[PDB]
PDB file of all heavy atoms in Angstrom:
ATOM      1  N   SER A  17      92.030 102.929 108.196  1.00 54.00           N
ATOM      2  CA  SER A  17      91.625 103.325 106.852  1.00 54.00           C
ATOM      3  C   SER A  17      92.793 103.934 106.082  1.00 54.00           C
ATOM      4  O   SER A  17      93.739 104.424 106.715  1.00 54.00           O
ATOM      5  CB  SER A  17      90.462 104.316 106.913  1.00 54.00           C
ATOM      6  OG  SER A  17      90.838 105.504 107.587  1.00 54.00           O
ATOM      7  N   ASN A  18      92.737 103.878 104.774  1.00 54.05           N
ATOM      8  CA  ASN A  18      93.800 104.434 103.948  1.00 54.05           C
ATOM      9  C   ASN A  18      93.505 105.895 103.653  1.00 54.05           C
ATOM     10  O   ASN A  18      92.444 106.229 103.120  1.00 54.05           O
ATOM     11  CB  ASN A  18      93.914 103.667 102.633  1.00 54.05           C
ATOM     12  CG  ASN A  18      94.196 102.201 102.842  1.00 54.05           C
ATOM     13  OD1 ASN A  18      95.047 101.828 103.646  1.00 54.05           O
ATOM     14  ND2 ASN A  18      93.484 101.354 102.108  1.00 54.05           N
ATOM     15  N   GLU A  19      94.450 106.766 103.987  1.00 54.05           N
ATOM     16  CA  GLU A  19      94.265 108.192 103.759  1.00 54.05           C
ATOM     17  C   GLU A  19      95.594 108.924 103.771  1.00 54.05           C
ATOM     18  O   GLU A  19      96.545 108.495 104.424  1.00 54.05           O
ATOM     19  CB  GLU A  19      93.378 108.780 104.854  1.00 54.05           C
ATOM     20  CG  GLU A  19      93.979 108.572 106.236  1.00 54.05           C
ATOM     21  CD  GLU A  19      93.112 109.088 107.365  1.00 54.05           C
ATOM     22  OE1 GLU A  19      92.129 109.809 107.094  1.00 54.05           O
ATOM     23  OE2 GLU A  19      93.431 108.773 108.529  1.00 54.05           O
ATOM     24  N   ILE A  20      95.651 110.028 103.038  1.00 53.66           N
ATOM     25  CA  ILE A  20      96.844 110.854 103.006  1.00 53.66           C
ATOM     26  C   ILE A  20      96.439 112.177 103.633  1.00 53.66           C
ATOM     27  O   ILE A  20      95.486 112.810 103.183  1.00 53.66           O
ATOM     28  CB  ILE A  20      97.328 111.159 101.570  1.00 53.66           C
ATOM     29  CG1 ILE A  20      97.663 109.862 100.828  1.00 53.66           C
ATOM     30  CG2 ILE A  20      98.542 112.088 101.633  1.00 53.66           C
ATOM     31  CD1 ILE A  20      97.970 110.067  99.344  1.00 53.66           C
ATOM     32  N   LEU A  21      97.143 112.581 104.682  1.00 53.06           N
ATOM     33  CA  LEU A  21      96.859 113.853 105.328  1.00 53.06           C
ATOM     34  C   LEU A  21      97.983 114.815 104.944  1.00 53.06           C
ATOM     35  O   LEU A  21      99.124 114.637 105.363  1.00 53.06           O
ATOM     36  CB  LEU A  21      96.801 113.680 106.851  1.00 53.06           C
ATOM     37  CG  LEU A  21      95.779 112.677 107.399  1.00 53.06           C
ATOM     38  CD1 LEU A  21      95.765 112.751 108.925  1.00 53.06           C
ATOM     39  CD2 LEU A  21      94.396 112.985 106.846  1.00 53.06           C
ATOM     40  N   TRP A  22      97.662 115.822 104.135  1.00 49.30           N
ATOM     41  CA  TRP A  22      98.660 116.793 103.690  1.00 49.30           C
ATOM     42  C   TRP A  22      98.716 118.001 104.615  1.00 49.30           C
ATOM     43  O   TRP A  22      97.675 118.536 104.999  1.00 49.30           O
ATOM     44  CB  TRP A  22      98.339 117.293 102.278  1.00 49.30           C
ATOM     45  CG  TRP A  22      98.228 116.232 101.224  1.00 49.30           C
ATOM     46  CD1 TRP A  22      97.152 115.425 100.976  1.00 49.30           C
ATOM     47  CD2 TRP A  22      99.220 115.891 100.246  1.00 49.30           C
ATOM     48  NE1 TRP A  22      97.412 114.606  99.898  1.00 49.30           N
ATOM     49  CE2 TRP A  22      98.673 114.871  99.433  1.00 49.30           C
ATOM     50  CE3 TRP A  22     100.516 116.351  99.975  1.00 49.30           C
ATOM     51  CZ2 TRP A  22      99.381 114.300  98.366  1.00 49.30           C
ATOM     52  CZ3 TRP A  22     101.222 115.783  98.911  1.00 49.30           C
ATOM     53  CH2 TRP A  22     100.649 114.768  98.123  1.00 49.30           C
ATOM     54  N   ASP A  23      99.923 118.442 104.964  1.00 52.22           N
ATOM     55  CA  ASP A  23     100.058 119.610 105.822  1.00 52.22           C
ATOM     56  C   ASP A  23     100.147 120.858 104.954  1.00 52.22           C
ATOM     57  O   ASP A  23     100.081 120.772 103.728  1.00 52.22           O
ATOM     58  CB  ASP A  23     101.282 119.491 106.743  1.00 52.22           C
ATOM     59  CG  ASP A  23     102.606 119.693 106.018  1.00 52.22           C
ATOM     60  OD1 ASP A  23     102.626 119.924 104.789  1.00 52.22           O
ATOM     61  OD2 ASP A  23     103.646 119.623 106.703  1.00 52.22           O
ATOM     62  N   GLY A  24     100.299 122.011 105.591  1.00 54.26           N
ATOM     63  CA  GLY A  24     100.360 123.270 104.866  1.00 54.26           C
ATOM     64  C   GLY A  24     101.510 123.480 103.895  1.00 54.26           C
ATOM     65  O   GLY A  24     101.480 124.427 103.107  1.00 54.26           O
ATOM     66  N   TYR A  25     102.519 122.614 103.943  1.00 51.59           N
ATOM     67  CA  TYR A  25     103.668 122.740 103.050  1.00 51.59           C
ATOM     68  C   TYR A  25     103.671 121.673 101.968  1.00 51.59           C
ATOM     69  O   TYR A  25     104.665 121.497 101.265  1.00 51.59           O
ATOM     70  CB  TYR A  25     104.978 122.663 103.840  1.00 51.59           C
ATOM     71  CG  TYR A  25     105.242 123.881 104.690  1.00 51.59           C
ATOM     72  CD1 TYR A  25     104.992 123.870 106.062  1.00 51.59           C
ATOM     73  CD2 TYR A  25     105.726 125.053 104.116  1.00 51.59           C
ATOM     74  CE1 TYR A  25     105.221 125.002 106.843  1.00 51.59           C
ATOM     75  CE2 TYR A  25     105.955 126.188 104.883  1.00 51.59           C
ATOM     76  CZ  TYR A  25     105.702 126.157 106.244  1.00 51.59           C
ATOM     77  OH  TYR A  25     105.930 127.283 106.994  1.00 51.59           O
ATOM     78  N   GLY A  26     102.558 120.961 101.842  1.00 53.27           N
ATOM     79  CA  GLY A  26     102.462 119.931 100.828  1.00 53.27           C
ATOM     80  C   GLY A  26     103.188 118.651 101.192  1.00 53.27           C
ATOM     81  O   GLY A  26     103.616 117.905 100.310  1.00 53.27           O
ATOM     82  N   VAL A  27     103.342 118.401 102.491  1.00 54.95           N
ATOM     83  CA  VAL A  27     104.000 117.188 102.953  1.00 54.95           C
ATOM     84  C   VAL A  27     102.917 116.146 103.194  1.00 54.95           C
ATOM     85  O   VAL A  27     101.980 116.374 103.955  1.00 54.95           O
ATOM     86  CB  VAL A  27     104.774 117.419 104.268  1.00 54.95           C
ATOM     87  CG1 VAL A  27     105.348 116.107 104.770  1.00 54.95           C
ATOM     88  CG2 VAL A  27     105.893 118.435 104.039  1.00 54.95           C
ATOM     89  N   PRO A  28     103.031 114.987 102.538  1.00 55.90           N
ATOM     90  CA  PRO A  28     102.038 113.929 102.702  1.00 55.90           C
ATOM     91  C   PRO A  28     102.320 112.965 103.851  1.00 55.90           C
ATOM     92  O   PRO A  28     103.428 112.449 103.990  1.00 55.90           O
ATOM     93  CB  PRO A  28     102.081 113.224 101.357  1.00 55.90           C
ATOM     94  CG  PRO A  28     103.553 113.247 101.049  1.00 55.90           C
ATOM     95  CD  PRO A  28     103.976 114.658 101.453  1.00 55.90           C
ATOM     96  N   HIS A  29     101.300 112.740 104.671  1.00 53.01           N
ATOM     97  CA  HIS A  29     101.380 111.806 105.780  1.00 53.01           C
ATOM     98  C   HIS A  29     100.463 110.682 105.307  1.00 53.01           C
ATOM     99  O   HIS A  29      99.236 110.779 105.375  1.00 53.01           O
ATOM    100  CB  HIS A  29     100.854 112.457 107.058  1.00 53.01           C
ATOM    101  CG  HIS A  29     101.706 113.586 107.541  1.00 53.01           C
ATOM    102  ND1 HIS A  29     102.715 113.415 108.465  1.00 53.01           N
ATOM    103  CD2 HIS A  29     101.728 114.896 107.198  1.00 53.01           C
ATOM    104  CE1 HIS A  29     103.321 114.571 108.669  1.00 53.01           C
ATOM    105  NE2 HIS A  29     102.741 115.486 107.912  1.00 53.01           N
ATOM    106  N   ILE A  30     101.086 109.630 104.797  1.00 55.14           N
ATOM    107  CA  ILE A  30     100.380 108.489 104.243  1.00 55.14           C
ATOM    108  C   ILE A  30     100.104 107.384 105.249  1.00 55.14           C
ATOM    109  O   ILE A  30     101.028 106.803 105.814  1.00 55.14           O
ATOM    110  CB  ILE A  30     101.187 107.923 103.058  1.00 55.14           C
ATOM    111  CG1 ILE A  30     101.468 109.056 102.064  1.00 55.14           C
ATOM    112  CG2 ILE A  30     100.427 106.783 102.390  1.00 55.14           C
ATOM    113  CD1 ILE A  30     102.856 109.010 101.440  1.00 55.14           C
ATOM    114  N   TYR A  31      98.821 107.104 105.470  1.00 56.89           N
ATOM    115  CA  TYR A  31      98.412 106.053 106.391  1.00 56.89           C
ATOM    116  C   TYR A  31      97.781 104.914 105.612  1.00 56.89           C
ATOM    117  O   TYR A  31      96.836 105.123 104.843  1.00 56.89           O
ATOM    118  CB  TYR A  31      97.412 106.588 107.427  1.00 56.89           C
ATOM    119  CG  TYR A  31      97.982 107.665 108.320  1.00 56.89           C
ATOM    120  CD1 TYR A  31      98.012 108.992 107.906  1.00 56.89           C
ATOM    121  CD2 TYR A  31      98.532 107.349 109.564  1.00 56.89           C
ATOM    122  CE1 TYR A  31      98.574 109.979 108.696  1.00 56.89           C
ATOM    123  CE2 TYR A  31      99.101 108.336 110.368  1.00 56.89           C
ATOM    124  CZ  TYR A  31      99.119 109.649 109.923  1.00 56.89           C
ATOM    125  OH  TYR A  31      99.693 110.635 110.687  1.00 56.89           O
ATOM    126  N   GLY A  32      98.313 103.712 105.808  1.00 57.06           N
ATOM    127  CA  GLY A  32      97.793 102.545 105.116  1.00 57.06           C
ATOM    128  C   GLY A  32      97.487 101.416 106.083  1.00 57.06           C
ATOM    129  O   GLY A  32      98.149 101.273 107.112  1.00 57.06           O
ATOM    130  N   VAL A  33      96.479 100.614 105.758  1.00 60.78           N
ATOM    131  CA  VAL A  33      96.091  99.496 106.610  1.00 60.78           C
ATOM    132  C   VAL A  33      97.085  98.340 106.490  1.00 60.78           C
ATOM    133  O   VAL A  33      97.117  97.444 107.333  1.00 60.78           O
ATOM    134  CB  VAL A  33      94.666  99.014 106.262  1.00 60.78           C
ATOM    135  CG1 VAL A  33      93.658 100.104 106.619  1.00 60.78           C
ATOM    136  CG2 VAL A  33      94.568  98.680 104.778  1.00 60.78           C
ATOM    137  N   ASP A  34      97.891  98.369 105.433  1.00 60.73           N
ATOM    138  CA  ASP A  34      98.926  97.362 105.206  1.00 60.73           C
ATOM    139  C   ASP A  34     100.040  97.983 104.367  1.00 60.73           C
ATOM    140  O   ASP A  34      99.928  99.133 103.939  1.00 60.73           O
ATOM    141  CB  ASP A  34      98.365  96.107 104.515  1.00 60.73           C
ATOM    142  CG  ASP A  34      97.604  96.418 103.241  1.00 60.73           C
ATOM    143  OD1 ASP A  34      97.993  97.361 102.521  1.00 60.73           O
ATOM    144  OD2 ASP A  34      96.621  95.699 102.951  1.00 60.73           O
ATOM    145  N   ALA A  35     101.113  97.232 104.136  1.00 62.44           N
ATOM    146  CA  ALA A  35     102.246  97.747 103.374  1.00 62.44           C
ATOM    147  C   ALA A  35     101.905  98.218 101.961  1.00 62.44           C
ATOM    148  O   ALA A  35     102.160  99.370 101.613  1.00 62.44           O
ATOM    149  CB  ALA A  35     103.370  96.705 103.329  1.00 62.44           C
ATOM    150  N   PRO A  36     101.322  97.341 101.125  1.00 64.07           N
ATOM    151  CA  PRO A  36     100.981  97.754  99.760  1.00 64.07           C
ATOM    152  C   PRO A  36     100.140  99.030  99.708  1.00 64.07           C
ATOM    153  O   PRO A  36     100.299  99.843  98.797  1.00 64.07           O
ATOM    154  CB  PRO A  36     100.235  96.541  99.209  1.00 64.07           C
ATOM    155  CG  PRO A  36     100.873  95.404  99.938  1.00 64.07           C
ATOM    156  CD  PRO A  36     100.952  95.933 101.346  1.00 64.07           C
ATOM    157  N   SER A  37      99.251  99.205 100.683  1.00 65.83           N
ATOM    158  CA  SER A  37      98.402 100.395 100.721  1.00 65.83           C
ATOM    159  C   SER A  37      99.228 101.657 100.954  1.00 65.83           C
ATOM    160  O   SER A  37      98.945 102.709 100.381  1.00 65.83           O
ATOM    161  CB  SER A  37      97.340 100.261 101.815  1.00 65.83           C
ATOM    162  OG  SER A  37      96.422  99.224 101.500  1.00 65.83           O
ATOM    163  N   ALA A  38     100.247 101.549 101.799  1.00 67.27           N
ATOM    164  CA  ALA A  38     101.115 102.680 102.092  1.00 67.27           C
ATOM    165  C   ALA A  38     101.947 103.035 100.860  1.00 67.27           C
ATOM    166  O   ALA A  38     102.136 104.211 100.552  1.00 67.27           O
ATOM    167  CB  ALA A  38     102.028 102.350 103.265  1.00 67.27           C
ATOM    168  N   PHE A  39     102.446 102.024 100.156  1.00 68.60           N
ATOM    169  CA  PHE A  39     103.246 102.283  98.959  1.00 68.60           C
ATOM    170  C   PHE A  39     102.393 102.913  97.858  1.00 68.60           C
ATOM    171  O   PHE A  39     102.861 103.774  97.116  1.00 68.60           O
ATOM    172  CB  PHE A  39     103.909 100.994  98.456  1.00 68.60           C
ATOM    173  CG  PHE A  39     105.171 100.631  99.199  1.00 68.60           C
ATOM    174  CD1 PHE A  39     105.114 100.101 100.482  1.00 68.60           C
ATOM    175  CD2 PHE A  39     106.419 100.841  98.618  1.00 68.60           C
ATOM    176  CE1 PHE A  39     106.280  99.781 101.181  1.00 68.60           C
ATOM    177  CE2 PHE A  39     107.591 100.526  99.305  1.00 68.60           C
ATOM    178  CZ  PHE A  39     107.523  99.995 100.589  1.00 68.60           C
ATOM    179  N   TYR A  40     101.137 102.485  97.764  1.00 65.34           N
ATOM    180  CA  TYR A  40     100.210 103.029  96.775  1.00 65.34           C
ATOM    181  C   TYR A  40      99.986 104.513  97.076  1.00 65.34           C
ATOM    182  O   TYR A  40     100.039 105.351  96.176  1.00 65.34           O
ATOM    183  CB  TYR A  40      98.877 102.276  96.839  1.00 65.34           C
ATOM    184  CG  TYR A  40      97.774 102.861  95.982  1.00 65.34           C
ATOM    185  CD1 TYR A  40      97.579 102.434  94.669  1.00 65.34           C
ATOM    186  CD2 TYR A  40      96.906 103.824  96.496  1.00 65.34           C
ATOM    187  CE1 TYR A  40      96.540 102.945  93.889  1.00 65.34           C
ATOM    188  CE2 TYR A  40      95.866 104.347  95.724  1.00 65.34           C
ATOM    189  CZ  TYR A  40      95.688 103.900  94.424  1.00 65.34           C
ATOM    190  OH  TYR A  40      94.654 104.400  93.667  1.00 65.34           O
ATOM    191  N   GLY A  41      99.734 104.836  98.343  1.00 67.49           N
ATOM    192  CA  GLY A  41      99.518 106.225  98.717  1.00 67.49           C
ATOM    193  C   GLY A  41     100.757 107.075  98.466  1.00 67.49           C
ATOM    194  O   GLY A  41     100.661 108.248  98.096  1.00 67.49           O
ATOM    195  N   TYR A  42     101.924 106.471  98.662  1.00 68.40           N
ATOM    196  CA  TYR A  42     103.201 107.151  98.465  1.00 68.40           C
ATOM    197  C   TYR A  42     103.402 107.433  96.973  1.00 68.40           C
ATOM    198  O   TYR A  42     103.866 108.509  96.593  1.00 68.40           O
ATOM    199  CB  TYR A  42     104.328 106.268  99.029  1.00 68.40           C
ATOM    200  CG  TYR A  42     105.700 106.917  99.154  1.00 68.40           C
ATOM    201  CD1 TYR A  42     105.843 108.285  99.387  1.00 68.40           C
ATOM    202  CD2 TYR A  42     106.860 106.134  99.108  1.00 68.40           C
ATOM    203  CE1 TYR A  42     107.113 108.861  99.577  1.00 68.40           C
ATOM    204  CE2 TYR A  42     108.128 106.695  99.298  1.00 68.40           C
ATOM    205  CZ  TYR A  42     108.248 108.056  99.532  1.00 68.40           C
ATOM    206  OH  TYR A  42     109.500 108.601  99.728  1.00 68.40           O
ATOM    207  N   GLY A  43     103.042 106.474  96.126  1.00 67.45           N
ATOM    208  CA  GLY A  43     103.182 106.679  94.693  1.00 67.45           C
ATOM    209  C   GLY A  43     102.229 107.776  94.260  1.00 67.45           C
ATOM    210  O   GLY A  43     102.569 108.644  93.454  1.00 67.45           O
ATOM    211  N   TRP A  44     101.021 107.734  94.814  1.00 66.59           N
ATOM    212  CA  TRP A  44      99.992 108.720  94.517  1.00 66.59           C
ATOM    213  C   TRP A  44     100.518 110.106  94.865  1.00 66.59           C
ATOM    214  O   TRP A  44     100.449 111.023  94.054  1.00 66.59           O
ATOM    215  CB  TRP A  44      98.739 108.439  95.351  1.00 66.59           C
ATOM    216  CG  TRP A  44      97.477 108.991  94.769  1.00 66.59           C
ATOM    217  CD1 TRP A  44      96.623 108.352  93.914  1.00 66.59           C
ATOM    218  CD2 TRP A  44      96.916 110.285  95.003  1.00 66.59           C
ATOM    219  NE1 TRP A  44      95.566 109.164  93.606  1.00 66.59           N
ATOM    220  CE2 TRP A  44      95.718 110.359  94.260  1.00 66.59           C
ATOM    221  CE3 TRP A  44      97.307 111.389  95.769  1.00 66.59           C
ATOM    222  CZ2 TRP A  44      94.905 111.493  94.259  1.00 66.59           C
ATOM    223  CZ3 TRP A  44      96.498 112.522  95.770  1.00 66.59           C
ATOM    224  CH2 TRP A  44      95.311 112.564  95.018  1.00 66.59           C
ATOM    225  N   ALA A  45     101.042 110.246  96.081  1.00 66.55           N
ATOM    226  CA  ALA A  45     101.571 111.525  96.558  1.00 66.55           C
ATOM    227  C   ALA A  45     102.717 112.039  95.695  1.00 66.55           C
ATOM    228  O   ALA A  45     102.751 113.216  95.332  1.00 66.55           O
ATOM    229  CB  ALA A  45     102.029 111.394  98.006  1.00 66.55           C
ATOM    230  N   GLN A  46     103.661 111.161  95.368  1.00 65.37           N
ATOM    231  CA  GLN A  46     104.792 111.564  94.544  1.00 65.37           C
ATOM    232  C   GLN A  46     104.347 112.038  93.166  1.00 65.37           C
ATOM    233  O   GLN A  46     104.915 112.984  92.613  1.00 65.37           O
ATOM    234  CB  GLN A  46     105.791 110.416  94.400  1.00 65.37           C
ATOM    235  CG  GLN A  46     106.746 110.295  95.579  1.00 65.37           C
ATOM    236  CD  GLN A  46     107.944 109.421  95.269  1.00 65.37           C
ATOM    237  OE1 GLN A  46     108.519 109.500  94.181  1.00 65.37           O
ATOM    238  NE2 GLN A  46     108.342 108.597  96.233  1.00 65.37           N
ATOM    239  N   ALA A  47     103.331 111.387  92.611  1.00 64.84           N
ATOM    240  CA  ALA A  47     102.833 111.777  91.298  1.00 64.84           C
ATOM    241  C   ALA A  47     102.210 113.164  91.381  1.00 64.84           C
ATOM    242  O   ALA A  47     102.418 113.998  90.509  1.00 64.84           O
ATOM    243  CB  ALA A  47     101.800 110.766  90.794  1.00 64.84           C
ATOM    244  N   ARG A  48     101.453 113.418  92.441  1.00 62.89           N
ATOM    245  CA  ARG A  48     100.818 114.721  92.591  1.00 62.89           C
ATOM    246  C   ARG A  48     101.842 115.839  92.756  1.00 62.89           C
ATOM    247  O   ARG A  48     101.679 116.929  92.208  1.00 62.89           O
ATOM    248  CB  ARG A  48      99.879 114.729  93.800  1.00 62.89           C
ATOM    249  CG  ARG A  48      99.178 116.061  93.985  1.00 62.89           C
ATOM    250  CD  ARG A  48      98.229 116.071  95.171  1.00 62.89           C
ATOM    251  NE  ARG A  48      97.690 117.412  95.386  1.00 62.89           N
ATOM    252  CZ  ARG A  48      96.939 117.764  96.426  1.00 62.89           C
ATOM    253  NH1 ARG A  48      96.629 116.874  97.359  1.00 62.89           N
ATOM    254  NH2 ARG A  48      96.506 119.013  96.534  1.00 62.89           N
ATOM    255  N   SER A  49     102.901 115.557  93.506  1.00 63.27           N
ATOM    256  CA  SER A  49     103.939 116.544  93.777  1.00 63.27           C
ATOM    257  C   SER A  49     105.047 116.657  92.725  1.00 63.27           C
ATOM    258  O   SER A  49     105.572 117.747  92.497  1.00 63.27           O
ATOM    259  CB  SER A  49     104.589 116.242  95.134  1.00 63.27           C
ATOM    260  OG  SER A  49     103.626 116.177  96.179  1.00 63.27           O
ATOM    261  N   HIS A  50     105.409 115.531  92.078  1.00 68.24           N
ATOM    262  CA  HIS A  50     106.501 115.558  91.112  1.00 68.24           C
ATOM    263  C   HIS A  50     106.197 114.667  89.911  1.00 68.24           C
ATOM    264  O   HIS A  50     107.137 114.165  89.255  1.00 68.24           O
ATOM    265  CB  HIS A  50     107.811 115.121  91.771  1.00 68.24           C
ATOM    266  CG  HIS A  50     108.290 116.054  92.839  1.00 68.24           C
ATOM    267  ND1 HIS A  50     108.758 117.321  92.565  1.00 68.24           N
ATOM    268  CD2 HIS A  50     108.375 115.906  94.182  1.00 68.24           C
ATOM    269  CE1 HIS A  50     109.110 117.910  93.694  1.00 68.24           C
ATOM    270  NE2 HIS A  50     108.887 117.076  94.688  1.00 68.24           N
ATOM    271  N   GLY A  51     104.931 114.487  89.562  1.00 66.93           N
ATOM    272  CA  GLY A  51     104.546 113.631  88.450  1.00 66.93           C
ATOM    273  C   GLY A  51     105.200 113.807  87.085  1.00 66.93           C
ATOM    274  O   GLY A  51     105.643 112.832  86.481  1.00 66.93           O
ATOM    275  N   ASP A  52     105.240 115.033  86.574  1.00 64.85           N
ATOM    276  CA  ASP A  52     105.842 115.276  85.265  1.00 64.85           C
ATOM    277  C   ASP A  52     107.268 114.719  85.165  1.00 64.85           C
ATOM    278  O   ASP A  52     107.569 113.927  84.270  1.00 64.85           O
ATOM    279  CB  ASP A  52     105.855 116.773  84.954  1.00 64.85           C
ATOM    280  CG  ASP A  52     104.461 117.349  84.781  1.00 64.85           C
ATOM    281  OD1 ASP A  52     103.479 116.573  84.774  1.00 64.85           O
ATOM    282  OD2 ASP A  52     104.352 118.584  84.647  1.00 64.85           O
ATOM    283  N   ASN A  53     108.136 115.126  86.085  1.00 63.95           N
ATOM    284  CA  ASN A  53     109.521 114.666  86.072  1.00 63.95           C
ATOM    285  C   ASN A  53     109.678 113.179  86.381  1.00 63.95           C
ATOM    286  O   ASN A  53     110.561 112.525  85.827  1.00 63.95           O
ATOM    287  CB  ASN A  53     110.374 115.505  87.036  1.00 63.95           C
ATOM    288  CG  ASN A  53     110.702 116.882  86.475  1.00 63.95           C
ATOM    289  OD1 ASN A  53     111.329 117.707  87.139  1.00 63.95           O
ATOM    290  ND2 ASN A  53     110.278 117.133  85.243  1.00 63.95           N
ATOM    291  N   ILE A  54     108.835 112.637  87.256  1.00 65.44           N
ATOM    292  CA  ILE A  54     108.927 111.214  87.572  1.00 65.44           C
ATOM    293  C   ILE A  54     108.602 110.398  86.318  1.00 65.44           C
ATOM    294  O   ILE A  54     109.308 109.442  85.992  1.00 65.44           O
ATOM    295  CB  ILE A  54     107.967 110.821  88.725  1.00 65.44           C
ATOM    296  CG1 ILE A  54     108.503 111.377  90.050  1.00 65.44           C
ATOM    297  CG2 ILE A  54     107.826 109.300  88.800  1.00 65.44           C
ATOM    298  CD1 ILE A  54     107.610 111.106  91.254  1.00 65.44           C
ATOM    299  N   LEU A  55     107.544 110.775  85.607  1.00 66.69           N
ATOM    300  CA  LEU A  55     107.187 110.056  84.386  1.00 66.69           C
ATOM    301  C   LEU A  55     108.285 110.195  83.330  1.00 66.69           C
ATOM    302  O   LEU A  55     108.610 109.234  82.637  1.00 66.69           O
ATOM    303  CB  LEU A  55     105.858 110.565  83.821  1.00 66.69           C
ATOM    304  CG  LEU A  55     104.639 110.117  84.625  1.00 66.69           C
ATOM    305  CD1 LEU A  55     103.404 110.801  84.086  1.00 66.69           C
ATOM    306  CD2 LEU A  55     104.505 108.594  84.564  1.00 66.69           C
ATOM    307  N   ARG A  56     108.862 111.386  83.209  1.00 69.20           N
ATOM    308  CA  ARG A  56     109.923 111.587  82.227  1.00 69.20           C
ATOM    309  C   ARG A  56     111.103 110.673  82.547  1.00 69.20           C
ATOM    310  O   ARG A  56     111.633 110.005  81.663  1.00 69.20           O
ATOM    311  CB  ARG A  56     110.383 113.050  82.205  1.00 69.20           C
ATOM    312  CG  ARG A  56     111.345 113.360  81.065  1.00 69.20           C
ATOM    313  CD  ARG A  56     111.564 114.856  80.929  1.00 69.20           C
ATOM    314  NE  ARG A  56     112.218 115.412  82.108  1.00 69.20           N
ATOM    315  CZ  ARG A  56     112.345 116.713  82.348  1.00 69.20           C
ATOM    316  NH1 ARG A  56     111.859 117.597  81.485  1.00 69.20           N
ATOM    317  NH2 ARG A  56     112.960 117.129  83.450  1.00 69.20           N
ATOM    318  N   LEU A  57     111.502 110.641  83.815  1.00 69.89           N
ATOM    319  CA  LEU A  57     112.611 109.791  84.254  1.00 69.89           C
ATOM    320  C   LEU A  57     112.324 108.301  84.037  1.00 69.89           C
ATOM    321  O   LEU A  57     113.201 107.556  83.590  1.00 69.89           O
ATOM    322  CB  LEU A  57     112.921 110.056  85.734  1.00 69.89           C
ATOM    323  CG  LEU A  57     113.536 111.436  86.009  1.00 69.89           C
ATOM    324  CD1 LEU A  57     113.623 111.690  87.511  1.00 69.89           C
ATOM    325  CD2 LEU A  57     114.921 111.508  85.368  1.00 69.89           C
TER     326      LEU A  57
END
């Protein structure tokens, strides 16, 4: 199953059933953690 398990320091452990799913979770995680600056860039 696709899921992101976050630890106590805000580190995302992204699990995907396939490659695209992992990249999607990674984009999701990056947006949550650094969204403002990523969008600006």
Side-chain angles (χ1 to χ4, degrees):
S17 62
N18 301 315
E19 59 182 349
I20 300 172
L21 302 186
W22 303 80
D23 74 0
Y25 289 101
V27 175
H29 294 267
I30 306 141
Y31 297 84
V33 294
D34 53 35
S37 293
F39 279 75
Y40 173 91
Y42 191 30
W44 204 91
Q46 278 195 42
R48 181 179 174 187
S49 305
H50 295 291
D52 294 353
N53 284 177
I54 288 177
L55 287 173
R56 188 169 64 191
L57 291 172

